[PDB]
Amino acid sequence: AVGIGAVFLGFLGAAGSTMGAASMTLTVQARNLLSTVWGIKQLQARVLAVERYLRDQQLLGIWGCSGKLICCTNVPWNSSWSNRNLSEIWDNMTWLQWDKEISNYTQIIYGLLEESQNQQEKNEQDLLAL
Amino acid sequence: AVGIGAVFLGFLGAAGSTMGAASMTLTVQARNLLSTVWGIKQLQARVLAVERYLRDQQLLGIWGCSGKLICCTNVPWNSSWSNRNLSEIWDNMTWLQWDKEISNYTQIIYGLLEESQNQQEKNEQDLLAL
Amino acid sequence: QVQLQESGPGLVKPSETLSLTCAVSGVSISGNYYWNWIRQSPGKGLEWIGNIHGNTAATVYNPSLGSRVTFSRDTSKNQFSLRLDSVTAADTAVYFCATLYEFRVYMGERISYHDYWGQGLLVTVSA
Amino acid sequence: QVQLQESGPGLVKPSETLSLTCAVSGVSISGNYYWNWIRQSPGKGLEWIGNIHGNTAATVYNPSLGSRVTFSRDTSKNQFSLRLDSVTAADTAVYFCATLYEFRVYMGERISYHDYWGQGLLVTVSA
Amino acid sequence: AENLWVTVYYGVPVWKDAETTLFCASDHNVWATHACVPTDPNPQEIHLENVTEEFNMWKNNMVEQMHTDIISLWDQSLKPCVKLTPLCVTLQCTNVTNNITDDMRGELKNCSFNMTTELRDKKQKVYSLFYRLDVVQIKEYRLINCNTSACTQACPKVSFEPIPIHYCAPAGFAILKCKDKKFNGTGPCPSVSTVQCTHGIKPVVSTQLLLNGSLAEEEVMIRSENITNNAKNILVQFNTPVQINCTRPNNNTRKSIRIGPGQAFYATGDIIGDIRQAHCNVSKATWNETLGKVVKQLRKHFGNNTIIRFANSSGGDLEVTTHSFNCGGEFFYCNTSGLFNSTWISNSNDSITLPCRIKQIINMWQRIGQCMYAPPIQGVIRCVSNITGLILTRDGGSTNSTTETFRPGGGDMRDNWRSELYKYKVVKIEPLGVAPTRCKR
Amino acid sequence: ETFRPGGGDMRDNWRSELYKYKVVKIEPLGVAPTRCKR
Amino acid sequence: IRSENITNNAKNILVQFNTPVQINCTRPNNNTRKSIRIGPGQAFYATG
Ligand SMILES: *[C@@H]1O[C@H](CO)[C@@H](O[C@@H]2O[C@H](CO)[C@@H](O[C@@H]3O[C@H](CO)[C@@H](O)[C@H](O[C@H]4O[C@H](CO)[C@@H](O)[C@H](O)[C@@H]4O[C@H]4O[C@H](CO)[C@@H](O)[C@H](O)[C@@H]4O)[C@@H]3O)[C@H](O)[C@H]2NC(C)=O)[C@H](O)[C@H]1NC(C)=O
Ligand SMILES: *[C@@H]1O[C@H](CO)[C@@H](O[C@@H]2O[C@H](CO)[C@@H](O[C@@H]3O[C@H](CO)[C@@H](O)[C@H](O)[C@@H]3O)[C@H](O)[C@H]2NC(C)=O)[C@H](O)[C@H]1NC(C)=O
Ligand SMILES: *[C@@H]1O[C@H](CO)[C@@H](O[C@@H]2O[C@H](CO)[C@@H](O[C@@H]3O[C@H](CO)[C@@H](O)[C@H](O)[C@@H]3O)[C@H](O)[C@H]2NC(C)=O)[C@H](O)[C@H]1NC(C)=O
Ligand SMILES: *[C@@H]1O[C@H](CO)[C@@H](O[C@@H]2O[C@H](CO)[C@@H](O)[C@H](O)[C@H]2NC(C)=O)[C@H](O)[C@H]1NC(C)=O
Ligand SMILES: *[C@@H]1O[C@H](CO)[C@@H](O[C@@H]2O[C@H](CO)[C@@H](O)[C@H](O)[C@H]2NC(C)=O)[C@H](O)[C@H]1NC(C)=O
Ligand SMILES: *[C@@H]1O[C@H](CO)[C@@H](O[C@@H]2O[C@H](CO)[C@@H](O)[C@H](O)[C@H]2NC(C)=O)[C@H](O)[C@H]1NC(C)=O
Ligand SMILES: *[C@@H]1O[C@H](CO)[C@@H](O[C@@H]2O[C@H](CO)[C@@H](O)[C@H](O)[C@H]2NC(C)=O)[C@H](O)[C@H]1NC(C)=O
C-alpha cells in the first residue's frame, strides 16, 4: 500500500478497449497531436502538423465545443445513421469499428452541427436584446 | 487636467514589483509572446515560437482555463508545497522569487489540475443526462 | 529488460562516509518509481535502509538508523546514490538496490507486477 | 457550361445485365445533386428509372422495375453508372442521364434553375 | 484552515537562461546589409528596478553567433569573383633599385611571366611588381600559395569598411543589459535594463590593439577569466582614445590584364616618384600617460610594490607577432616594438614611428587552403584611428621573482567581439504561473 | 524447378528489413450517440 | 520465403535464413600507395 510505484497505459494501446473504456483516457491521445533540402522537408512537415491542429481546433470551435474534450450537443440522432442501442455501442464495440460503420454519414452531421450552433447564437443574441 | 498626455510602463517593467502589483499588467506581457540558410534559421525560429505559443494554449485549455488570464480552480493548496500566509506572498514577494521557491512542485500540480478538470467534465456530462 | 548495477568502494574505515551508486538501464529513473536501498548481513538478515522517489525526489529512511543517510538521484546519468555517514563495524553487509511497482490501466484493473532485485555489492567497514 | 455524355454497350442479350455510365463535365458529382436516369421507348414515352444522391449515396428506384435497378457513383472519374438486371424486350429505349437543381442563397430567395438532359444513347435488347 | 486553492496566471514576468538565434537590424560591402532588416529610428529601453541579474562574459553564446555570421558573410561576398588559377607559372624576377631608400632594399620584385588571353590558342608576355613576402624562390620564383591551393581575387568594388550592425532577438525572448559602471564582466549586476536590441557594433578586425572601439566611462578596466592563471589573456579597456596615423606613401599604379573571356587581373604597373616604407605614428606623451594608468590599475591585482615590465612579442607567425590591420583596402602588418618596451617601479611634440609592411595574399581567418588576393590601390593612402584597448598576456609569473612582464597577444578574433558584447545577455520568458488564492471554481 | 541467383535492384535489400513496419495517421475527432441535451 | 506472386516467374523470391552462414574472405596482395600532386592542393593516389 505504501512504497509501491504505479505506471499506466499511455498511447494508443487503449484502442482495443470498448468505446466506454476508450473514451476515459482522451488526454493521452490529445496531448500527442502537437509534439538543406532535408531542412525544407522537416519544416514542411512541422507546418503541416501545425496547420492540421489549427484546422481541427477551428472545426471544434465553430460547433461551440471550444476548449472541451467531451461536448454533447443539441442535434438529435437520426435513426437512419445507426439503429443500434446504447447497450451494443458503448459496451460491445470499439472506436475503429464505429468509425468504419458511420464513415459515410459524417459531413451531413457536421453541417447540421454548424447550422444548429448558428441558430443557437442568433437566438441567444435575440434573447439578450431584451 | 486637460491636454496632458500619459505614458505607462513597458514590456517587463513590473519584474521587480510585488506579485499583487505585477498581476494587474498581465496583458502587456501576454501580447508579445506571439509578435538562404539564414532564411531557414529565421523560419525555424518563427515556427518554434508558434509551437511554444500553441503548447502553452493547449496546456491552459486542458485545465479548463481557456481564454482567461486569471482562472480559479478546485484543487486544494497542499501545505507541504508552501507554508507562508497571503500577507507575505501578495504584498512582500515577487514572481521570480516565488518561482524559485516553488519550482520543485510543478508537475504534480499540473496532473492534479488535469484529473480535476476531467472529473468535472464527466460530472457535468452526467448531470446534463437528466 | 531492466538491469540494476551497484558500484562503490569495497572497503571503508570507521566513522567515514560510505557512498554507493546504483545505475539503472532499461527504464528512466525520473518516472513514478520508488528506488529502494536494502542490505543483508549475517545475523541480522535483510534490513531495508530506505527509498527515494524519482519524480519528486521524496525520500524516506529507516527510523532506526536515523539521519546518518542521504539519498540522491541523477537523471542525466540515470542513477541513484546512497551516502551513509559515520560507518561502523555493524554496517558491513551486502547492499542491494531494487524497485517494486505495478503496471495497471488508468482508473481500472491491474496488468502486472515488477521487481528486479539487482545483484548487489559487498561492503566491509574496517580501518 | 455543364455537359453530360452517356456510354456503354448498345446491344444486350435478354436476362443479362445492362450497364450504362454517364460522365459529367463542368461540375463535380460530390455536391448536393441528384443524378437521375430516364428512358424513352415507343408508345410508353418518358419513363423514370431512379436517382442517386452524390454526396451521401442515397438511392431511390422506381417501384415498377423492382430490385432490378442499381446505381453507383465514381468521384475520381466524375461519373455515375446505372445497372439493370434481367433485361427483357420491354427495355429497348433511348436512355438519358439528367439532373435538376436550383441555385439560391442561404436563408433568402432563389436565383436560378438548372436542368441539362444530356444527349443519351439508344439501347436494344436481343440475343 | 488555509482553505486556499491553486490559481493559474498567464503572463507572469519570469525568465530563464536560454540560447537562440538573433537577426539583423542595420540603418557594396563585404558585410551584406541588403539581407539585414532596417532598424527602428527610436530604440526602446526599459529600466528594471530591484532586479539584480547574474552575468558572465566568458560564457556568452552571442560571441559564437557573431563569429559564425561574420565568417559566413565573408565567404559569401567572395563567391562571384575571379579565380586566379592561371597565376601559378614560373615567374622570372629581378630586383627593383630605382630610387629606393636603404630600408626598402629587396622588398619589391619586378617579375615577368607568360599568361593566357581571351583566345585559348594564344599567349602574352606580361610583368608586375610583387612584394617579397608573396614570392618564394623555386632567378625563378613562384607564388607562395601555389603548392597549397589556388585561390580567389577579391572583386575591386566591394569595400572592406566596417558598418555597425545590431542584433535583435525573436519573439518570446529578451535582451538584458547591465547599466552598472565598474562591472568587470563577471558576477552580479544590480542595475539592469531590457532592450529590444544592442547598439551598433563595428566588426573591426585587428590584432594586438583594439581600434575604433568603445571607451570605458569611468576609468581603465582590466578583465580576465582567471587573472591568477597566466594562460588566459587580459583585456584592457581605456577611458580615453589614443590617436594613431598610418600611411602608405607610394604612388602605386594599377593596370588590367585580360586573362580570359570577361576575366581581368589587376597588376601593379609601376611606382611614380620615390619608394618609401609605409609607417604609423603614435603620440609619445599620450602613450606614456595611458601606460601609467594601465600600470596603476594592474597594481591592484598583483601587489602594491611589484615591478611591471612591458616587453616584445614572443614570436610565431607574422599575424600573431605583429599588429595586423587593413587601411583602405591594403593589409598592413606592423611591428609594435617601440610601444611595449618599458619598466615601471613602485614609488613635447615628437612621436613614436612604427615602420611596417604591406601584404597582398591574405588568409584572413585561422584557416588553411583559401587566400584572398587584394587588388592594388591607386595612389597614396592615409588613415587615422583610435586605440581604445589592449590584449595582453603575462609571461612566466612564477613566485621565484617579484617582477611581472606582460607582452602583447591576439590571434583569436573572438576576443575582438567579446570586448563589445560583455554587458548583454539573452533570456526566455516563462508566462505560466501558479499561486494560492481563496477563490474557488 | 530451377532457381538461379538474382539481384541488381537495391530496393529488395531495404525491403528485407522494413517488412514488418507501417505508418499511420491519427484522426482524434469522433461523433457518437449520447443522452445529454445542450 | 516471400514473394509478391509465387506463381509468377517474373518476380524475385526473398529467402531469410534461420541461422547465419560465416563467409571469410580477403585480398592478400601487399599493396603500396603513392601520391602524385596534379595541381594546387590536388593529389592523385596510385598503386606504386
Ligand atoms: C576607424 O574609423 C576611421 C573613421 O571612421 C577610418 O578612417 C576612414 O577610413 C575610410 C576608408 O578607408 C576613409 O574613406 C575613404 O576616404 C578616401 C579619401 O577620401 C576615399 O578615396 C575613399 O573612397 C574610395 O573607396 C570607396 C570604398 O571604400 C569607394 O566607394 C570610392 O569610390 C573610392 O574608391 C575610388 O578610388 C579608389 C582609389 O583611387 C579606386 O581604387 C576605386 O576604384 C575608386 O575609383 C573612402 O571614402 C575615411 O576617409 C577615413 N576617415 C578619416 C577621418 O581618415 C579608419 O579606417 C577606421 N579604422 C579601421 C581599422 O577600420
Ligand atoms: C480484449 O478483448 C477481451 C475480450 O474480447 C477483453 O476481455 C474481456 O474483458 C471484459 C471486461 O474486462 C469481460 O467482461 C466480463 O463479461 C462477463 C460475461 O459474463 C461478465 O460477467 C463480467 O462481469 C465482465 O463484464 C470479458 O469477459 C472479457 N473477455 C474474455 C474472453 O475474458 C479484454 O479486456 C480486451 N483487452 C483490452 C486491453 O481491453
Ligand atoms: C523596489 O523595492 C522598493 C522597496 O524595496 C519598493 O518601494 C516600496 O514600495 C512600497 C509600495 O509602493 C512601499 O510600501 C508603502 O510603505 C509605506 C510606509 O510603510 C506605507 O504607508 C504604504 O501604505 C505602503 O505600504 C514601501 O515603503 C517602499 N519602500 C521604501 C523603502 O520606501 C519599490 O516600489 C520597488 N519597485 C517597484 C517598481 O515597485
Ligand atoms: C620592370 O621590368 C620591366 C621590363 O624589364 C620594365 O619595363 C621596361 O622599362 C624600360 C625603361 O625603364 C623600357 O625601355 C622597356 O621597353 C620596358 N619593357 C617593357 C617590356 O615594356 C619596368 O620599367 C620595370 N619596372 C621597374 C619599377 O623597375
Ligand atoms: C614565355 O614563354 C616563352 C616560350 O613560349 C619562353 O621562351 C623560352 O624560354 C626558355 C627558357 O625558359 C628557352 O629555353 C626557350 O628557347 C625560349 N623560347 C623562345 C621561343 O624564346 C619565355 O622564357 C617565357 N617567359 C618567361 C618570363 O619565362
Ligand atoms: C576617436 O575618439 C573621439 C573621442 O571619443 C571621437 O570624437 C567624438 O566623436 C563623437 C561621434 O559620435 C562625438 O559625439 C564626440 O563629440 C567626439 N568627441 C570629440 C572630443 O571630438 C572620434 O570620432 C573617434 N574617431 C574615430 C575614427 O572613431
Ligand atoms: C585560476 O588558475 C589557478 C592556477 O591554475 C588555479 O589554481 C590552481 O588549481 C589547480 C587545480 O588542480 C592546482 O593544481 C594548482 O596548484 C593551483 N595553482 C595555484 C597557484 O593556486 C585556480 O583554481 C584558478 N581559479 C579558478 C576559479 O578555478
Ligand SMILES: *[C@@H]1O[C@H](CO)[C@@H](O[C@@H]2O[C@H](CO)[C@@H](O)[C@H](O)[C@H]2NC(C)=O)[C@H](O)[C@H]1NC(C)=O
Ligand atoms: C609620421 O611622423 C614623421 C616624423 O617623425 C613624419 O615625417 C614628416 O612628414 C612631413 C609631412 O608633412 C614632412 O614635411 C617632413 O619632412 C617629414 N619629416 C621626416 C623627418 O620624415 C611623417 O609624415 C608622419 N606620417 C604620418 C602619416 O603622420
Ligand SMILES: *[C@@H]1O[C@H](CO)[C@@H](O[C@@H]2O[C@H](CO)[C@@H](O)[C@H](O)[C@H]2NC(C)=O)[C@H](O)[C@H]1NC(C)=O
Ligand atoms: C594625426 O593626424 C591628425 C590630422 O592630420 C593630426 O591632427 C592635426 O594636427 C595638426 C598639427 O598639430 C593640427 O594643425 C591640426 O589642426 C590637427 N587636425 C585634427 C583634425 O586634429 C594629428 O596631430 C596626427 N597625430 C599624430 C600622432 O601624428
Ligand SMILES: *[C@@H]1O[C@H](CO)[C@@H](O[C@@H]2O[C@H](CO)[C@@H](O)[C@H](O)[C@H]2NC(C)=O)[C@H](O)[C@H]1NC(C)=O
Ligand atoms: C623585440 O625586441 C628584441 C630585441 O631588440 C628583438 O630581438 C631581435 O630580433 C632580431 C631579429 O629580426 C635580431 O636580429 C636581433 O639580434 C634581436 N635582438 C637582440 C638584442 O638579440 C625582437 O625581434 C623584437 N620582437 C620582434 C617580434 O621582432
Ligand SMILES: *[C@@H]1O[C@H](CO)[C@@H](O[C@@H]2O[C@H](CO)[C@@H](O)[C@H](O)[C@H]2NC(C)=O)[C@H](O)[C@H]1NC(C)=O
Ligand atoms: C621590430 O623593431 C625592433 C626595433 O627596431 C627591431 O629590433 C632591431 O632588429 C634589427 C634587425 O633587423 C637589429 O639589427 C637591431 O639591433 C634591433 N634593435 C634593437 C633595439 O634590438 C626588430 O627586429 C623588429 N622586428 C622584426 C621582426 O624585425
Ligand SMILES: *[C@@H]1O[C@H](CO)[C@@H](O[C@@H]2O[C@H](CO)[C@@H](O)[C@H](O)[C@H]2NC(C)=O)[C@H](O)[C@H]1NC(C)=O
Ligand atoms: C500471379 O501470376 C499469374 C501469372 O501471370 C497470374 O495468372 C495469370 O493472369 C493473367 C491475366 O491476364 C492470365 O492471362 C494468365 O493466363 C494467368 N496465368 C495463370 C497460370 O493462371 C495471377 O493472376 C497472378 N496472381 C494475382 C493474385 O494476380
Ligand SMILES: *[C@@H]1O[C@H](CO)[C@@H](O[C@@H]2O[C@H](CO)[C@@H](O)[C@H](O)[C@H]2NC(C)=O)[C@H](O)[C@H]1NC(C)=O
Ligand atoms: C581459404 O581457404 C584456403 C584453403 O582452401 C586457404 O588456403 C590456406 O591458407 C593458409 C593461411 O593461413 C595457408 O597457411 C595455407 O597454406 C593455404 N592452403 C592452400 C592450399 O592454399 C586460405 O587461406 C583461406 N582464406 C581465407 C581468407 O580464409
Ligand SMILES: *[C@@H]1O[C@H](CO)[C@@H](O)[C@H](O)[C@H]1NC(C)=O
Ligand atoms: C636583391 O636584393 C636583396 C637585398 O639587397 C639581396 O639579398 C639579393 O641578393 C638581391 N638579388 C639580386 C641582386 O639578384
Ligand SMILES: *[C@@H]1O[C@H](CO)[C@@H](O)[C@H](O)[C@H]1NC(C)=O
Ligand atoms: C609549400 O612550400 C613551403 C615552402 O617550400 C612549405 O613550407 C610548405 O609546407 C609547402 N606546403 C605543403 C602543403 O607542404
Ligand SMILES: *[C@@H]1O[C@H](CO)[C@@H](O)[C@H](O)[C@H]1NC(C)=O
Ligand atoms: C571582478 O571579477 C571577480 C572575479 O572573481 C569577481 O569576484 C568580482 O565580483 C568582480 N567585481 C565586480 C565589481 O563585480
Ligand SMILES: *[C@@H]1O[C@H](CO)[C@@H](O)[C@H](O)[C@H]1NC(C)=O
Ligand atoms: C600620383 O601620380 C599621379 C599620376 O602622375 C598624379 O596625378 C598624382 O598627383 C600623384 N600623387 C601625388 C600624391 O603626388
Ligand SMILES: *[C@@H]1O[C@H](CO)[C@@H](O)[C@H](O)[C@H]1NC(C)=O
Ligand atoms: C627599448 O627600451 C630601451 C630602454 O631601456 C631603449 O634603450 C631601446 O632603444 C628601446 N628599443 C626600441 C626598439 O625602442
Ligand SMILES: *[C@@H]1O[C@H](CO)[C@@H](O)[C@H](O)[C@H]1NC(C)=O
Ligand atoms: C607488407 O609490406 C610491408 C613493408 O615491407 C611490411 O611491413 C608488412 O609486414 C607486409 N605485410 C605483411 C602481411 O607481411
